[PDB]
Amino acid sequence: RVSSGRDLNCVPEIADTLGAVAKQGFDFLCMPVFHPRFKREFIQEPAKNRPGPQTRSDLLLSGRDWNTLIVGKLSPWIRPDSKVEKIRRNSEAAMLQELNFGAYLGLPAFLLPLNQEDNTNLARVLTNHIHTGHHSSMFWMRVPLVAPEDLRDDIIENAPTTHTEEYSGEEKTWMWWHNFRTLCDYSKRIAVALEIGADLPSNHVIDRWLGEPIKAAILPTSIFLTNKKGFPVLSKMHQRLIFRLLKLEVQFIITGTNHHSEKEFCSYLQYLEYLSQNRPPPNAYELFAKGYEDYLQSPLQPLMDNLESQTYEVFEKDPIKYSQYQQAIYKCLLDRVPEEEKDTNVQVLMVLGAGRGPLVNASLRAAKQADRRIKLYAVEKNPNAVVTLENWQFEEWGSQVTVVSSDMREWVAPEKADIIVSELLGSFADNELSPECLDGAQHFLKDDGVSIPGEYTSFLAPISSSKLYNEVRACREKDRDPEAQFEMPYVVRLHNFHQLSAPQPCFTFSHPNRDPMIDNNRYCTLEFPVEVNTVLHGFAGYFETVLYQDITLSIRPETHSPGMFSWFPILFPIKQPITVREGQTICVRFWRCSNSKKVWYEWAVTAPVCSAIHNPTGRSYTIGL
């Protein structure tokens, strides 16, 4: 259940060692590919001409074992950023030599330390290796939660450790990573191997790493406390952290020698398996969403496109959502037909955008539960779904349901509706163009008719996540603007991210719309107070809707409808990550724009720095009318 590996800096025979760590339960081994103390010279004779072999042979393992079981390690004497020119040069040749041998062997990852502030020349040699061969190898940068200088015992009489808080100084190692990965151009092949120390820092330091590509956590044996019986275990705070890392499915690495000599080395590993099997199980939402974490999908456009059969199938296997719809219809019948009229009065109810008819059925179940009489129109422009409707109305619904194979903005209705019902809502509420559709339909609502839904509001929340920035970055396509992937929302089960401020309402729409001048364009300015240092990579979009009175649906996290998985949030990325300091305000601007043919959005940040206006005129993303 937990994928884990052993870190060693001493491997006398690779064959035995691998067997010993395989025996102890580990899935892989991080080891030197050259001997850690074998400093090599490349410039100065005689040491330059040291007889070979320079390291052990690749014939000692199978290609399968190299490819899956061995993580290389950079020799600790390699210092590309030494103040000494000779050492700078020797280490460049040595780092290339070692990275090439790693690529020669097919290693799946290779570890490299970030153990000081200036790693500029380290980054440059790594960048220059990545661009030589076009390989698939991973590079795990070994970064501590707490720099060793900020962790040393207070035992130097004339150089004491400062006992003041330094909010940003305590984050310094995040800035080591962050510079290093900027320099290297956000290569997808460069991840974090976060090293965890005996005493954790404040939460804000730990939260700097939210949204970062952590592929591994390194746990030294040092940090394991001992319980009464004598096993290795972890403090409650370390356990909290392990639980967070498990949700990131990192691989855990155990480094250091055995410090619980009475017990063996399974015990460390077993504790993690213990913590792993002993976490809260995934709810119904989190079962549905497994496999979609941070997976970028295009927002459905059910107006412009005819949805596929299986797409309506997923729409329908959300029972919570139609319970709410049924209840909203139920309450609405009772308000509209008094008990003494329950048989003289028949309500004309129109499902607008009927699909395969889950709302048509919810309306029937609602009029039975409410014991009132209804007349049902099922309008649907997708003629492939109208096939399903007309088979349902012949086989079951009967003449109670009139299927109408038409666009609701075209349909000349025979009579007016008491209630129009629709599920035309996207993850950003109005992003499937439900405002435009219901406006062309309201002319055949009665002057006192209800619309279900009656109201919906969208929501927005600045987020940080370099993992999603890179994914968005990967979406460059030939034959279009090379930044176009940054100007267009994405539906995504947001996972490895940090939400920087509380969501805040963006655009609201009401139905029926009682403007004498209906206008669905919008301009909205939002200020988000940010109380952390972070980096802004875009905006999370959610929505709420009032179906009827107090019956609602929401995917706003604060008020999420429990158990309903019909909508993942939507992501509005920006071209250029923006640095945001503690106490600053993120000001964002959101426009809803439209043609006679297209609706779209445009957005900028204007504080703490300006961004470009994104998706201007719908050059990169429209929603078809």
């Binding site: 025979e13 074998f38 001409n49 052990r56 030494s82 060793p148 004339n158 250091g256 020698t257």
Partner: protein, 310 residues
């Protein structure tokens, strides 16, 4: 070839130490090839080294030897790549080398060891940044110290004081220690960072002065009581991996380097001898107790050289 002695001796020689009577201790590691390990050798005939059939005793360790030191006349203290400090003890017959304790207390390669003046204690330095004080009698760690911020490069015990020893590190600190004080370590040396210190040698006569070499080939002479770096010389073209004072009443200072050369210096750090005999890194040096102008050096070229010093 005595029993229990490997038929062949690893190519990379790290340590070369003369006992009181003039017998030569040799530490070696295998830093390349299929198997990465080490061995300890005793040569009552110093001129027969490095030859394996002409040794008095030998043994194999699990892993490489990074530093070495005598513990009296029968004890051998080993800094292992395994993270173990090891104590080996000579035979009564002095024809075997038998393991006494192997304690895995460091979490990375142990890089340096030094016995304290009483001979009953030692301090080890490691790549795990910790420094440990050991009871060789009890085979336990008395203290563990995380004073440094990077790997520990060298720990040198005081000649005549169990309480005092030097350490240096890649964090650019030279720490004078005194376990009598509640904050035992004390940062000394120049305020300007300079270059990383790599080697330390206490002065055998003036127990308040020491010398340290840096990664840039400079040797420096320092008084722990007065001002800051009175004297220094650019002796080498690369890192200074070792500094050994001669037994003479007015001692000479031997200077080792990755530039593959030996230098012998006087009290003012002027150059007296210089040897190009080695074709790889010069790793250790000891003066003969018997003839005080004889100077032995070993290296990664597997040579054991014997120098005569004017």
């Amino acid at each position: 070839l005595p029993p229990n002695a490997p038929a062949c001796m690893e190519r990379q020689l790290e340590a070369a130490r003369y006992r009181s009577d003039g017998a030569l201790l040799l530490g070696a590691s295998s830093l390349s090839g299929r198997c990465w390990a080490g061995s300890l050798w005793l040569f009552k005939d110093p001129c027969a080294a490095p030859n394996e059939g002409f040794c008095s005793a030998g043994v194999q360790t699990e892993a490489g030897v990074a530093d070495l030191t005598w513990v009296g006349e029968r004890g051998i203290l080993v800094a292992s790549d395994s993270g173990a400090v090891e104590l080996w003890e000579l035979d009564e017959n002095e024809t075997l080398i038998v393991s006494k304790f192997c304690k895995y207390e460091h979490d990375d390669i142990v890089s340096t060891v030094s016995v304290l003046s009483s001979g009953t204690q030692a301090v080890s330095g490691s790549k795990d940044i910790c420094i440990k004080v050991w009871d060789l009698a009890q085979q336990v760690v008395l203290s563990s110290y995380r004073a440094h911020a990077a790997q520990v490069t060298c720990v040198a015990a005081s000649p005549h004081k169990d309480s005092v020893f030097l350490s240096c590190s890649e964090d650019n600190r030279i720490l004078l220690w005194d376990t009598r004080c509640p904050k035992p370590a004390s940062q000394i040396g120049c305020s300007a960072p300079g270059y990383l210190p790599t080697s330390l040698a206490w002065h055998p006569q003036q127990s308040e002065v020491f010398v340290f070499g840096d990664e840039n080939g400079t040797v420096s002479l320092v008084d722990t009581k007065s001002t800051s770096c009175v004297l220094s010389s650019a002796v080498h073209s690369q890192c200074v991996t070792g500094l050994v004072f001669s037994p003479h009443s007015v001692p000479f200072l031997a200077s080792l380097s990755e530039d593959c050369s030996l230098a012998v210096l006087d009290s003012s750090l002027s150059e007296l001898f210089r040897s190009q005999a080695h074709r790889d890194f010069v790793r250790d040096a000891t003066w003969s107790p018997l003839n005080h102008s004889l100077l032995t050096t070993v290296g990664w070229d597997h040579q054991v050289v014997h120098h005569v010093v004017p």
